Amino acid sequence: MDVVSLDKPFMYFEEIDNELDYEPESANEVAKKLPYQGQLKLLLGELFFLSKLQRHGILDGATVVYIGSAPGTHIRYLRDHFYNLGVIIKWMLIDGRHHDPILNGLRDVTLVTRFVDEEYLRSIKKQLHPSKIILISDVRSPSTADLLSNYALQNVMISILNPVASSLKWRCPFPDQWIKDFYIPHGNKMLQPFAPSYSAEMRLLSIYTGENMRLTRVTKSDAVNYEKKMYYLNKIVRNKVVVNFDYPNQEYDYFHMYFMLRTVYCNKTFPTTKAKVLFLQQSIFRFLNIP
Amino acid sequence: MDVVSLDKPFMYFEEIDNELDYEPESANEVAKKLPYQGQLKLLLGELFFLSKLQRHGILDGATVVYIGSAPGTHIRYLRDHFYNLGVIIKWMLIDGRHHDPILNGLRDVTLVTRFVDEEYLRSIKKQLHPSKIILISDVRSPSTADLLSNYALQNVMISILNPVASSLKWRCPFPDQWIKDFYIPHGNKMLQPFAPSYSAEMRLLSIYTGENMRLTRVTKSDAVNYEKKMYYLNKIVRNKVVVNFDYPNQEYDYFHMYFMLRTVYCNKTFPTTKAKVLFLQQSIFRFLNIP
Ligand SMILES: Nc1ncnc2c1ncn2[C@@H]1O[C@H](CSCC[C@H](N)C(=O)O)[C@@H](O)[C@H]1O
Numbered sequence A, B: 001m002d003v004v005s006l007d008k009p010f011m012y013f014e015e016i017d018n019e020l021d022y023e024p025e026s027a028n029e030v031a032k033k034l035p036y037q038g039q040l041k042l043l044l045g046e047l048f049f050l051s052k053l054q055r056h057g058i059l060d061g062a063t064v065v066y067i068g069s070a071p072g073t074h075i076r077y078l079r080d081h082f083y084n085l086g087v088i089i090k091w092m093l094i095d096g097r098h099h100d101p102i103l104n105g106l107r108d109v110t111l112v113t114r115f116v117d118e119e120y121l122r123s124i125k126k127q128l129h130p131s132k133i134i135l136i137s138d139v140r141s142p143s144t145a146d147l148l149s150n151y152a153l154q155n156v157m158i159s160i161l162n163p164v165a166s167s168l169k170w171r172c173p174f175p176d177q178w179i180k181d182f183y184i185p186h187g188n189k190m191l192q193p194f195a196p197s198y199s200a201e202m203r204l205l206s207i208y209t210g211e212n213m214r215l216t217r218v219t220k221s222d223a224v225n226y227e228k229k230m231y232y233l234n235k236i237v238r239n240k241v242v243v244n245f246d247y248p249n250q251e252y253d254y255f256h257m258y259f260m261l262r263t264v265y266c267n268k269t270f271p272t273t274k275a276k277v278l279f280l281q282q283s284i285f286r287f288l289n290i291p
């Protein structure tokens, strides 16, 4: 068994302290071990991001514009959690595909069947006005050309919508498929427990102060670094059994999940963080129909 | 006579401490009083910007890419000044129009007859590599549509060229001709002595640290502020005779010019700043054939 003792898990990309040459043979390996793992992956990250905004007092009264939201099964859980906490939020879910019918019939959630373009962002900006906007993007076209195009659209989401905060899907193009340098919004690169086995994807979390928009250039050398740091995390770290983690499941991803869930606010009071987390996890798994 | 006593002149936009409702009747007023005033305007500003970079140690060894450089008569002076100071700089002057023949035959200055597009910026970036780039832009199409297009191209100049510093032409669209909000690079808004009488144009000066690129959104309300602050500066301030300015010319613009010229480095040593300035001004006016 691959056992180890850890203080805390890597919460962000910059914390990863080692790298490994990527082995293309990893791509043939089992990418997922849990049913609805993709919904779980998104639920934990967005729960984490949104609880943070709540902590900063910027969630209550906002309209969350989630683009690339379908099917969005896990969004129903997120919606219930804050709604039950008393936070007032309006949800605007836009995608060209159809959403899970569990999202229907809620006065606080508007579902829109539209693939967004810059022109549309403008009309929704005019229509949402003057509400404060929190952007969550998970759009998907893939080629580096597809990626660049997605990232370019995500930056236009921010410039037109002018949100108070944002969570953007982020995976650096692979160096062996580099095309050209580009810019992405400055933010914290949140690492995702339950991501596919060899995924190099993370979520870029940003909070916009003032009327400024800070960007950061991404080069091929950055791409090489992303690849190696993520490969190390995937191949070595995520394969660890944190034996000093006294919890029903000691696998790295559960240890990592624990740290995200501990930042989540509940109505029910617990004697320990362990008890809150076990509760949130149970609740989450029951909702997604995960054993 | 319109007399007054001033400590220092408004060097940057943020320093302007008052505003005036714009009077459209001002547009019919004499815009210029000096021959080659436009070359003078540009020479003082670029001399100021470049002396600053020299002060920060970022000029020597750089390649200055000046887009929208033709005719560029005043550029010959700038080139001689630094060349005679011992600073090593390569100049790359790109415009679709023709440059003043005085710029020909200098091994350190390359003239290019090309209207730049994003694709071209890419090839020159590959060709300049690995030299450090200082961008100066003075391109001109005008309608707000023309302006936005120019500003959009200027931002692409920075993203592709990735310069160590930049000086960009900047005049906010007029509120009564607003189209949409947009972003411009963060920088100091340098005010221009000898600009036309009612010009609202300034020069955006930026220095790029790290791999970050900070932008700032510009709204119609910002546009209203630009208009009023600039109208106040033009109608009231620039029309002042700074009587406590003991100098051959006490008009506001000369007082303002004095402050820019005092930051300029010379080989010759002077007993006083007044003497250096009088010298630099004389030299500049003689060069441009201004009485
Ligand atoms: N321009 C665009 N506007 C909106 N959605 C888009 C888009 N381009 C792609 N998409 C959507 O991006 C989605 C990627 S899968 C998204 C899963 C979703 N976040 C969930 O929680 O289940 C697809 O549904 C796709 O239709």
Ligand SMILES: Nc1ncnc2c1ncn2[C@@H]1O[C@H](CSCC[C@H](N)C(=O)O)[C@@H](O)[C@H]1O
Binding pocket: B042, B067, B068, B069, B070, B071, B072, B073, B074, B075, B094, B095, B096, B097, B114, B115, B116, B117, B138, B139, B140, B141
């Ligand atoms: N894409 C482009 N590339 C280069 N120059 C451009 C351009 N679009 C416009 N211009 C140039 O912008 C200039 C504006 S006038 C510039 C005057 C010059 N700075 C001097 O010191 O005399 C024009 O010469 C125009 O041809």
Ligand SMILES: Cn1ccc(N)nc1=O
Binding pocket: A022, A027, A174, A176, A198, A199, A200, A227, A231
């Ligand atoms: C995950 N992954 C996939 C392809 C590739 N070239 N590198 C990677 O790190």
Ligand SMILES: Cn1ccc(N)nc1=O
Binding pocket: B022, B027, B174, B176, B198, B199, B200, B227, B231
């Ligand atoms: C200079 N200028 C010109 C036109 C206009 N509407 N406002 C101005 O301040």
